[PDB]
Amino acid sequence: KTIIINGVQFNTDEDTTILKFARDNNIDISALCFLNNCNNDINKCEICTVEVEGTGLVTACDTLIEDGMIINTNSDAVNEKIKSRISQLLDIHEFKCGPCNRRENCEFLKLVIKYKARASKPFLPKDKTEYVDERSKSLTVDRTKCLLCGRCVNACGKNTETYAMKFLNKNGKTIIGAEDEKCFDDTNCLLCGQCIIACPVAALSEKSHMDRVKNALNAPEKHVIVAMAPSVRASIGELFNMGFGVDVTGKIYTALRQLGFDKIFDINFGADMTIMEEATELVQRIENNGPFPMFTSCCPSWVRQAENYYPELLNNLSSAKSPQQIFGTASKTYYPSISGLDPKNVFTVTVMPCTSKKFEADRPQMEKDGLRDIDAVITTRELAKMIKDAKIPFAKLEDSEADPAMGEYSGAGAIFGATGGVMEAALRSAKDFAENAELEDIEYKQVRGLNGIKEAEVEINNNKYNVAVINGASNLFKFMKSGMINEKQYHFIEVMACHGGCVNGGGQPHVNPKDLEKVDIKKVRASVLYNQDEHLSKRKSHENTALVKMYQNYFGKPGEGRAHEILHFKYKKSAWSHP
């Protein structure tokens, strides 16, 4: 094919869109509703308008190049059309960036600036409460910001195949929302937040826990523990202009101390606890020749997916609490026992790359003797805002260490945040446990990486077992619906709702679509975690020194007795009932 773009001739056999071809050849075309190789098929945004000679104005993002095409991306007519489209979006947009939570990295603001667009009549809503939905424990909607670009609907479809985010006709006007405009929690929604990650503006956000945290910090009698997820240390630096793939663990510890938290622990300690219990459970299932398979239970969006779509699997879920909840349970029991704190005065905060962790922490039964396992969960983004609001110079902070008693972690815990990390971590301990050995070969590269469904054969005590790693909620559906679960007997299956694992969770820093094409965000964030594992002295969860002391002095033997009494949680399908 011979293509001419802005007077430049190209000769190509590529079969692709104008947008993709132009961008591959360093020709600027704007886009808004195009993302994840999809645009908004109904009511296209047309920000990607170009002019094709003999045809007129076309959308570059969904028009294939054809031989003989003569294209102009920057004519007066093209720019007036794009400016008009942005102007019409401003007409439905509460354009007040000052207090907006996307002020620093908004895609729409960049387009408004680029085209110098202005509303025909400013959109100034008197009563915002009609536009805002904060009922969810995890998600919130601010429709005064919504561009009806469809990126959340497309992302939910692709990431989960639930189509829990939908277009709705609300009193004659188009909105996005959950089925029948219900609270997301009351629908089949997984609360994974991939819709937030896809949103170009501040229309979708996490349910704020910021006030819970500040009120607890300011309460004289509260002793506030903070502990961050594996993924936070591989990601939060993005929001401080430090680039991608930067390990900022020590700076986080320092910032949390400067924020006034009273104890600095780490959820990777809870990850090692989860492995203690789950690898022990796997060995008991092996020794009892069932029940198989056992599924991980640490991703609360996967738990919701099982509850909503596969309730017959709930009995197969590991009973070990997630790293967050298992840490939290220990923070109200073991921690007072080594500190003198009144358990009622301990307030446990986690920092997560995840929105469904808020739903998990707020599950009614996730408590004991009136004490919540976890009192507040803030996302990576929320912690970034806290640090900036306190004027803490994050990129310049010196490194500090965590408090050790619930803060040490092994390399197995460190890799939890990548798809296959829980699998690899659990196998390192289950094989030692079952063979009564301290084995040297601990790297299970077969379960790593971005393939959507991964499987491997492992040898445990001179028998062979089959494991699988499901990498993304849509791939859970593919694995089940395609019958893949029945090609062989699976014994242990890891499921994460977010493709790439928690490093790509719904509470993570937004990345604009341009950077997403230069940077493999899922692999670059996960690289921080595998690097920590490679350089840590202890690379198995049962070699964590602070954890071994806690089990010896307080919990006893994992998987039974006291440990099973309080560190476990079982989900039950609803009993049969009609209708």
Residues within the interface to ligand 402 (CB under 6 A): 229-231, 267-268, 270-271, 298-299, 322-324, 352-354, 357, 416-417, 422, 502, 505
CA–chain centroid gap for 559, Å, is 29
Please check if 192 is assigned to a binding site.
Answer: yes
**Considering the complex, what minimum distance in angstroms separates the CB of residue 230 from ligand 402?**
4
**In whole angstroms, what is the distance from residue 61 CA to residue 325 CA?**
44
In the block, residue with structure tokens 């099973």: 564
**In whole angstroms, what is the distance from residue 26 CA to residue 24 CA?**
6
200 vs 500 by CB, closer to ligand 402: 500
Task: Give the per-residue SS3 of 435-479.
Answer: HCCCCCCCCCHHHCCCCCEEEEEEEECCEEEEEEEEECHHHHHHH
434: CB partners within 8 A, 6+ apart = 283, 286, 287, 460, 461
**Considering the complex, what minimum distance in angstroms separates the CB of residue 222 from ligand SF4?**
26
**Considering the complex, what minimum distance in angstroms separates the CB of residue 177 from ligand FES?**
21
Respond yes or no on whether the N-terminal peptide bond of residue 579 is cis (omega within 30° of 0). yes
The residue type of 219 is A
Select from ligand 402, ligand SF4, ligand FES, none the partner in contact with residue 253, using the beta carbon and a kind-dependent cut-off of 5 to 8 Å. none
**Considering the complex, what minimum distance in angstroms separates the CB of residue 199 from ligand SF4?**
3
Site string for ligand FES, 33-72 (x = CB under 6 A): xx----xx---xxxxx----------x-x-----------
Q: Which helix (H) or strand (E) holds 107?
A: helix 107-115
Please check if 298 is assigned to a binding site.
Answer: no
Please check if 100 is assigned to a binding site.
Answer: yes
**Considering the complex, what minimum distance in angstroms separates the CB of residue 559 from ligand FES?**
53
Of the residues 85, 137, 145, 321, which one makes contact with ligand SF4 according to CB under 6 A: 145
184 vs 444 by CB, closer to ligand SF4: 184
Candidates 198-206, 363-371, 424-432, 516-524: pick the segment binding ligand SF4 (CB under 6 A): 198-206
**Considering the complex, what minimum distance in angstroms separates the CB of residue 73 from ligand FES?**
13
Strand ranges, E, within 40-199: 49-52, 56-59, 70-72, 132-133, 139-142, 166-170, 173-177
Q: What is the dihedral of CA 69, 70, 73, 74, to 10 degrees?
A: -170
Compute CA distances 548 → 22, 229, 269, 409, 540, whole Å. Answer: 58, 21, 11, 11, 12
196: contact with ligand FES by CB under 6 A: no
Residues binding ligand FES: what is the number (CB under 6 A)?
13
202-241: contacts with Mg ion (CB under 5 A):
217
Please check if 183 is assigned to a binding site.
Answer: no
Select from Mg ion, ligand FES, ligand 402, none the partner in contact with residue 231, using the beta carbon and a kind-dependent cut-off of 5 to 8 Å. ligand 402
**In whole angstroms, what is the distance from residue 16 CA to residue 5 CA?**
15
Q: Beta partners for 469?
A: 454, 494
Q: Which helix (H) or strand (E) holds 2?
A: strand 2-5
**Annotated binding site for [4Fe-4S] cluster: which residue ranges?**
93, 97, 100, 106, 146, 149, 152, 156, 189, 192, 195, 199, 299, 354, 498, 502
Q: Could you list the residues known to form a binding site, using ranges.
A: 33, 45, 48, 61, 93, 97, 100, 106, 146, 149, 152, 156, 189, 192, 195, 199, 299, 354, 498, 502
